Design a protein around this ligand. Structure first.
Ligand code: HEM
Ligand code: F3S
Ligand code: NI
Ligand code: NI
Ligand code: NI
Ligand code: NI
Ligand code: NI
Ligand code: NI
Length: 464
């Protein structure tokens, strides 16, 4: 018994991509810099800190924190294809509409690699996590730019270009940076909840979730608040047309009007820079060009808003069904954060990441030729059952869980800190003013499937 070995924890710097989940477990044990990346220095773990240290190590989706036995001494020194049968499924008949767990289980069980409708889906954690970390082989640039001259900054870039974009942009998107915005975001969120509360009922998607992200976006980036509904309209049309081989005249015009609006905004920020993000990325040691900030602005609008909308809906749905959970969470920011992580783990708004391979690669004993289109199944991995943080159930055990709902590897969601901030604000201020509410009768929650959204079609709520 009494040979109790002590432990040390260290950071593998090549694995950290700044998820900052470790910091959420304990900010003093797991410090981060102004870009949201761990600055933990290797050290002996105090016996009283062992459980929180294990929790932080368990929270990192890149496995970048390593706990090892502190056992160095004078003797023990520490040095400083086989598969030819391709499974095929039809995407559109996966059982997704009612229960994502049943849907991803159907896909997972067909095999490590499943061909559906032109794409190779990688369904298994080993392959997905490895592929996310291997941008040389699994390229984002080859997959994620429409043949559109406006660069999709930073989504459609590989290292080293991608690395520069992340170095430049992460200081503006970190927990430290966004904390300065929180009084503003909280004030606007309180106002939105107050508009809802006095009604006694809503259809939460159309009435709140569809509006809340763009409202806060305008506040964050200093855009005119009266432009919200025009901008939502443009966003909705440009999202809808991305799937269309032959966009309508209304589609083309919507895209043109959004481009013209953002072009004028970006040019004005370059002429008269203020203490805002879109101004400041355009000056300093390594400036972004106007076209780069324009591409970034389009990406934030088209990818950072409907994702939060969808997560709002799932958050309110689950609270509506669970009265005792509502009561625990109210005025409980630490457990609200636990809850929001479970919602993103179980109902990630972008459940797969597309890539194109640059060289042959063997996955599941199967070799995929160079140039293969590949979808990495984050959502399925989040539910693969391989540990207690990976079930199909909502798990409220007081701990921050690792998951891949915000992606992983270098493209890990740039807005992940913001998404968590907005979702925890919403849940907290909803429960503050609307502690008890229920689903309207005869409601069955479903997503629209197959489609470009994994969000609830609607969410009818009622209260007194
Ligand atoms: C719950 C809400 C959100 C979820 C589930 C989500 C999910 C994701 C995922 C999985 C990726 C990686 C895609 C890939 O590897 O190809 C990603 C990338 C990205 N997301 Fe988020 N997102 C959310 C909210 C936001 C917000 C609020 C913003 C900013 C306003 C945003 C901006 C971005 C950007 C700029 C990237 C590209 C990062 C890069 O390629 O380096 N997202 N998102
Ligand atoms: S910030 Fe922390 S959660 Fe992981 S990716 Fe870096 S050690
Ligand atoms: Ni002993
Ligand atoms: Ni002894
Ligand atoms: Ni001792
Ligand atoms: Ni040990
Ligand atoms: Ni050792
Ligand atoms: Ni030993």
């Amino acid at each position: 018994a009494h040979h109790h070995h002590h432990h040390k924890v260290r950071l593998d710097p090549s694995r950290c991509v700044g998820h900052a989940q470790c910091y959420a477990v304990d900010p003093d044990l797991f410090p981060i810099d102004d870009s949201g990346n761990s600055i933990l220095a290797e050290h002996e773990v105090r016996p009283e800190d062992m459980q929180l240290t294990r929790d932080g190590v368990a929270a990192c989706p890149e496995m970048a924190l390593i706990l090892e036995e502190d056992d160095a001494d004078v003797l023990h020194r520490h040095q400083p294809a086989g598969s030819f049968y391709l499974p095929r499924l039809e995407y559109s008949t996966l059982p997704m509409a009612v229960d994502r767990g049943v849907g991803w289980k159907t896909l997972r069980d067909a095999g490590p690699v499943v061909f559906m409708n032109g794409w190779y889906y990688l369904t298994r954690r080993e392959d997905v996590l490895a592929a996310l970390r291997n941008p040389k082989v699994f390229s984002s640039r080859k997959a994620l730019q429409p043949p559109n001259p406006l660069p999709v900054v930073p989504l459609a870039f590989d290292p080293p270009e991608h690395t520069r974009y992340r170095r430049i942009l992460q200081p503006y998107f970190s927990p430290a940076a966004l904390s300065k915005a929180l009084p503003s975001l909280r004030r606007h969120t309180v106002a939105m909840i107050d508009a809802i509360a006095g009604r006694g009922e809503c259809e939460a998607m159309a009435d709140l979730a569809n509006l809340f992200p763009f409202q806060l976006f305008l506040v964050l980036y200093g855009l005119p608040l009266e432009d919200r509904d025009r901008l939502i309209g443009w966003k909705d049309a440009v999202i809808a047309m991305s799937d269309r081989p032959h966009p309508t005249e209304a589609d083309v015009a919507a895209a043109r009007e959004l481009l013209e609006y953002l072009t004028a905004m970006v040019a004005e920020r370059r002429r008269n820079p203020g203490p805002d993000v879109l101004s400041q990325v355009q000056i300093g040691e390594d400036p972004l060009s106007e076209i780069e900030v324009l591409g970034l602005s389009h990406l934030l609008i088209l990818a950072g808003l409907d994702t939060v909308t969808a997560a709002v809906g799932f958050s309110l749905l689950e609270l509506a069904r669970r009265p005792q959970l509502r009561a625990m969470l109210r005025d409980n920011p630490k457990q609200i954060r636990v809850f929001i992580e479970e919602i993103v783990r179980l109902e990630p708004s972008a459940p797969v990441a597309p890539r194109v391979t640059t060289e042959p690669v063997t996955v599941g004993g199967m070799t995929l030729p160079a140039g293969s289109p590949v979808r990495l199944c984050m959502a399925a991995v989040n539910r693969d059952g391989s540990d207690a943080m990976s079930t199909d159930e909502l798990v409220m055990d007081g701990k921050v869980h690792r998951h891949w709902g915000f992606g992983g590897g270098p493209h890990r969601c740039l807005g992940s800190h913001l998404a968590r901030l907005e979702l925890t604000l919403l849940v907290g201020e909803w429960l503050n003013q609307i502690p008890d509410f229920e689903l309207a009768p005869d409601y069955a929650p479903e997503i629209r499937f197959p489609s470009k959204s994994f969000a609830l079609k609607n969410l009818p709520l009622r209260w007194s």
